[PDB]
Design a protein around this ligand. Structure first.
Ligand SMILES: CC(C)C[C@H](C(=O)N[C@@H](C(=O)Nc1ccc(Cl)c(Cl)c1)C(C)C)P(=O)(O)O
Ligand SMILES: [Zn+2]
Length: 329
């Protein structure tokens, strides 16, 4: 097998169709020239076509690429497409999203996005077309799985959704924030922060929302979540003092989502600087049962290591009613 390039399409009916090879770079694929077969796979990312099944052998998506129709059109029909539920090619978008997320973590932090139990780098396995009408995505400890959506959502393959799911793995392999209570809200938030960071890495801008690009225009929802004012969704909370023990992690995530938005918008600050503090806290300070307040201490320690302004962080923490005075015993 050799290194090859893939030309084709991505996007969906809402955000529009674009072309790998014109609007965005070509995709990194592999080819077995002896059999004129190509694979949606490279060293860093493997795309699996689940075929709307709930299980798979996780072999890479494979498609015919003939010397006489190097660069080849993607898709089982060699036309650049892999259409499903209003998306041009969720498998192309998954291969690109994995590239972006892998290179964001390498370029910004010199770290693998994912690693095995023994520290060896872990290939990003992006499993697409999962299930029948599955309107979600999930991380399972070793790979990222994305449905094709149904009446409410387009296929859930985007930079943001991919960044969110890969970063559940980043958290599991670092702080290990447990997926309930306050630590679980932080876990969810870090993944929503990484969705923004992936967008910022790719195009230098981010929506401050989760999933607007995959919500159908007739669903009645503009987005899954809003980071500037989480309570816009009717359930998420904007400050730590509004937390209660029965609040799901997808709603208590509003605390650190709002905090991330606030910090990134302090004078002189940007998304990358805010994410630097969060990533370093996840890597070096946050503990599996962290409270919101303890997570603020970790942010402060991380910022001190990086040389970043602590008063700007303290002001942001106070705005989401996190008690950082506790950090100084
Ligand atoms: C970026 C996205 C795709 C990540 C996933 C996610 O947030 N999507 C769902 C959600 O809002 N769930 C949710 C909300 C409330 C409760 Cl009570 C529970 Cl149980 C789950 C769904 C609505 C698409 P993930 O965190 O599960 O991997
Ligand atoms: Zn999540």
């Amino acid at each position: 097998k050799v290194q090859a390039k893939g030309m084709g399409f991505g996007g969906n009916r809402k955000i529009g169709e674009y072309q790998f090879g014109k609007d965005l770079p070509l995709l990194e694929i592999t080819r077995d020239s002896s059999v004129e077969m190509c694979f949606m796979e490279n060293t860093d990312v493997k795309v699996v076509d689940m075929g709307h099944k709930y299980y798979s052998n996780n072999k890479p998506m494979q498609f015919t690429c003939k010397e006489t129709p190097k660069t080849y059109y993607t898709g089982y029909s060699a036309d650049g497409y892999d259409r499903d539920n209003g998306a041009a090619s969720p498998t192309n978008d998954a291969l690109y999203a994995g590239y972006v997320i892998k290179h964001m973590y390498h370029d910004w932090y010199g770290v693998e996005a994912l690693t095995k139990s023994d520290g060896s780098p872990m290939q990003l396995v992006m499993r697409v077309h999962y299930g029948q009408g599955y309107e979600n995505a999930y991380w399972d400890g070793k790979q990222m799985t994305f449905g094709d959506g149904d009446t409410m959502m387009y296929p859930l393959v985007s930079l943001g959704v991919g960044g969110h799911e890969v970063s559940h793995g980043f958290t599991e392999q670092h702080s290990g924030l447990e997926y309930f209570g306050q630590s679980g809200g932080m876990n969810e938030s870090f993944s929503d922060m990484a969705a923004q960071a992936a967008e910022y890495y790719s195009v230098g801008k981010n929506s401050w929302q989760i999933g607007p690009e995959i919500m159908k225009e007739d669903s009645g929802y503009d987005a899954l979540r809003y980071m500037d004012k989480p309570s816009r969704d009717g359930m998420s909370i904007d400050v730590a003092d509004d937390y209660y023990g029965g609040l799901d992690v997808h709603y208590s995530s509003g605390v650190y989502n709002h905090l991330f938005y606030i910090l990134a918008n302090q004078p002189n600050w940007n998304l990358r600087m805010a994410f630097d503090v969060m990533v370093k806290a996840n890597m070096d300070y946050w503990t599996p049962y962290s409270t919101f307040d303890e997570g603020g201490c970790g942010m402060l320690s991380a910022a001190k290591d990086l040389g970043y302004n602590l008063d700007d962080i303290k002001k942001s923490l106070s705005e989401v009613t996190i008690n950082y005075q506790s950090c100084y015993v």
